[PDB]
Amino acid sequence: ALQNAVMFDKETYDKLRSEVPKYKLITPSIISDRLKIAVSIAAAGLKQLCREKLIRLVSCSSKTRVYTRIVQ
Amino acid sequence: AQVGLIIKVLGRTGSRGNVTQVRVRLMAEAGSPDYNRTIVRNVKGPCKENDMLSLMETEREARRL
Amino acid sequence: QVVVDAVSKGAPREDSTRVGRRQAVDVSPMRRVNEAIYQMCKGAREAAFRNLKSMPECLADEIVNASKGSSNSYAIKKKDEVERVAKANR
RNA sequence: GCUUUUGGUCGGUGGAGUGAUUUGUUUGGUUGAUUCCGUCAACGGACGAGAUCCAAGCUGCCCAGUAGAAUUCAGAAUUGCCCAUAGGAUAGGCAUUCGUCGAAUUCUUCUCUGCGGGAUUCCUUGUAAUGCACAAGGUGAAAUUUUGGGCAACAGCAGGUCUGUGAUGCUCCUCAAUGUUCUGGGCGACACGCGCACUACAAUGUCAGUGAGAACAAGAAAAACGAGUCGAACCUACUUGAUCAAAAGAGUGGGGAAACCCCGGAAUCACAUAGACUCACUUGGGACCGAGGAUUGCAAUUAUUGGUCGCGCAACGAGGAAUGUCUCGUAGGCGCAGCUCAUCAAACUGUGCCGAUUACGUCCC
RNA sequence: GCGCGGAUAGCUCAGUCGGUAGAGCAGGGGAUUGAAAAUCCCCGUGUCCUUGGUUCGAUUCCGAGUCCGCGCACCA
Ligand SMILES: NC[C@@H]1O[C@H](O[C@H]2[C@@H](O)[C@H](O[C@@H]3[C@@H](O)[C@H](N)C[C@H](N)[C@H]3O[C@H]3O[C@H](CO)[C@@H](O)[C@H](O)[C@H]3N)O[C@@H]2CO)[C@H](N)[C@@H](O)[C@@H]1O
Ligand SMILES: [Mg+2]
Ligand SMILES: [Mg+2]
């Protein structure tokens, strides 16, 4: 089946800003099955967390972008 | 698993020639009972002499030729 | 170091072929480096075939679980299946 | 073409046997090789193998207004205080850049290429044990037939070709001809079974952008029609069409082809593109067919081909029993030329690009 | 109607005496393999015949009852 949502609910966007910066090794496919959202949202949700400095961009390419938590 | 050293390659064996008959020295820790023991065993894969390999049951010896 | 620990654990130390019955035969150190690399690229390739996960994650998961010697790796399921068949085909 | 990618065949004179026939042509090592060394009732030869020939890799001389390079004055451009919306990794006497359709004045580094060097198991230290040679390493651009092809004896197959020829014997047809030309069909028709490709089944991807950037190659015409000389047929850049889709349609140049296409802007690939999709028969796949339109042709119907918008609800989610090819710039992937060609490549002959896994073994099939 | 045994996946069957099911074998996959049979490794799968007393918890303990075997019974 694998029915993923195509936009955020208010409940799961609160999961995006809280649990995801606590993870180590954030990728848009790790977020896609933990949060049950499409990768087109999960990649868009993680670009938002970099400009707020909540997560770190550890490796970037045009297709694959790997994120990590910021340790401070 | 004991690590033994190939001191002699005795020729390509089996029907298809994929198995190699070697003579492997067991290389134990020199105070051991089974030190400087040499065994005649079958090796699967490309093997030259002086190539170490791991052995599960060292008490078997293969039938030569 | 995680890769060299994955290659070192990735391939079976023993195997079984017909030399004459199905006798258990030792595996050379060259093939053990070949078959470890072969069975990790395999299996990580089959994981990501119709998966949400990218190939650099599925390849990174096979290398990690084989480095730890966990059975979650594809290679370590086949590394242990071959050695127990070789132990019974002695 | 195939017996056959094999190392094989033939005389002479001598020996052997009543003879067909043997010997030479071999038991031993050796090599891809009846290739060599040794033995030897044989001794001397001939062919095949090797050699020669082509192509590729390194190189000498010659060489260039049909190949290219540096410099030096002039001309032009950037020129620093600058840290992307969130902005990582990575060289640094006289800063740098070039239809700028500049002048000069010195060159062969790359390019082209006629003959020529270079490779021989040459050197080295285990195998073998005189020998012929072999393995590992050196040397080197290249290391063992250097690589890749061409050419290939003797016998033979009742293989294919009488659809290649003004190659042919025999035999059939021979004026409402089985001759030869028109016109129209057919070779292509589809319950089906098989060879061979092509395209996929997707995220190591599809799309839309953007960058870097190949080699082999092709290219126009006649005792015709036109102005013994020249034109037009062929391929092409460039402008145009364009105060508005492609596909076109037009001008204007150039090229007989190292001189023009051309600084040959191939496609894989690449990209820190802060691009869309997010695991679905789905933005995978593009079969099927509907409607405009434009070119090839004397003629497009049983769509010639391209292009545009539809269709995509056509299987197809990696394939049963079986099966094919391959050992290094290779397999696989990727395109491009030429050839068929007025128009048409899922073909074949070539060429480049990206570039591995495995074995370096054996006689199991 | 008397005592003994049998009931446990499709087939087959040992149970810990009242703390959760097992092997045997068949059904779908890779391996052997050039192709075999056999051999292997891997994924199905039984509310454990019905009832209760329901011992912390009933295939296991216990009280009846259906079913099936043997050896025995026997005056409306
Ligand atoms: N004319 C050469 C012939 O080579 C033959 O020998 C050839 C065979 O032993 C062998 O040829 C084999 C072939 O059998 C087999 N069917 C296919 C294989 N690829 C070939 O291999 C040969 O050719 C290719 C070149 O493409 C190379 O890979 C390889 O180095 C080479 N050994 O290698 C030799 C070719 O070098 C015979 N000795 C003889 O018929 C003749 O000398
Ligand atoms: Mg004679
Ligand atoms: Mg089938």
What Å distances lie between residue A15 and A30, A45, A58, B32, C32, CA to CA?
A: 13, 11, 22, 61, 45
**What is the Cα–Cα distance from C78 to C86, expressed in whole angstroms?**
12
Q: Which two tokens stand for residue B22?
A: 């070697």
**What is the Cα–Cα distance from B6 to C18, expressed in whole angstroms?**
22
How far: A61 CA to D270 C1' (Å)?
Answer: 12
Name, in order, each residue with C-beta under 8 angstroms of B6's C-beta and a sequence gap of 6 or more.
B22, B23, B24, B25, B43, B47, B48, B49, B50, B51, B52, B53
DSSP state at residue C80 = H
User: Taking Cα atoms as reference points, which of B15, B16, B11, B14 lies closest to residue B47?
Assistant: B11
Name, in order, each residue with C-beta under 8 angstroms of C7's C-beta and a sequence gap of 6 or more.
C33, C36, C37, C40
- A55 touches A68 (CB < 8 A): yes
Resolution (A): 2.7
Query: Which residue of C lies nearest to B17 if distances are taken between CA atoms?
Result: C19
Kindly state whether C57 is in contact with chain B, defined as any CB-CB distance less than 8 angstroms. Answer: no
Helices (H), A1-59: 10-18, 30-34, 39-51
- CATH assignment of the domain containing B25: 2.40.50.140
**What is the Cα–Cα distance from B33 to A39, expressed in whole angstroms?**
62
Q: Do B44 and C20 touch (CB under 8 A)?
A: no
State the total domains in chain B.
1
Range of the domain at B4: 1-65
User: Taking Cα atoms as reference points, which of C86, C39, C26 lies closest to residue C65?
Assistant: C39
Residues from chain C that touch B22, judged by Cβ atoms under 8 A, are 26
Which residue in C8, C13, C19, C32 has the most chain B C-beta atoms within 10 A of its own C-beta, making it the best mutation to test that interface? C19
Residue A3 carries which side chain, given as an amino acid letter?
Answer: Q
Name, in order, each residue with C-beta under 8 angstroms of C59's C-beta and a sequence gap of 6 or more.
C40, C41, C44, C48
What residue segments make up the domains of chain A, in order of their start? 1-72
CA A11 to mean position of chain CA atoms: 15
Backbone angles phi, psi at A17, to 5 degrees: -90, -5
Region of A36 please: left (phi>0), alpha (psi -120 to 50) or beta.
left
User: Taking Cα atoms as reference points, which of B21, B32, B28, B13 lies closest to residue B61?
Assistant: B21
How far: C13 CA to D159 C1' (Å)?
Answer: 56
DSSP state at residue A37 = B
Calculate the dihedral angle through the C-alpha atoms of C44, C45, C50, C54, rounding to the nearest 10 degrees.
70
- B3 touches B58 (CB < 8 A): no
Collapse the DSSP code of C25 into the 3-class scheme (helix H, G, I; strand E, B; otherwise coil) and give the result. strand
Q: Does domain A1-72 have CATH number 1.10.10.10?
A: yes
Method of determination is cryo-EM
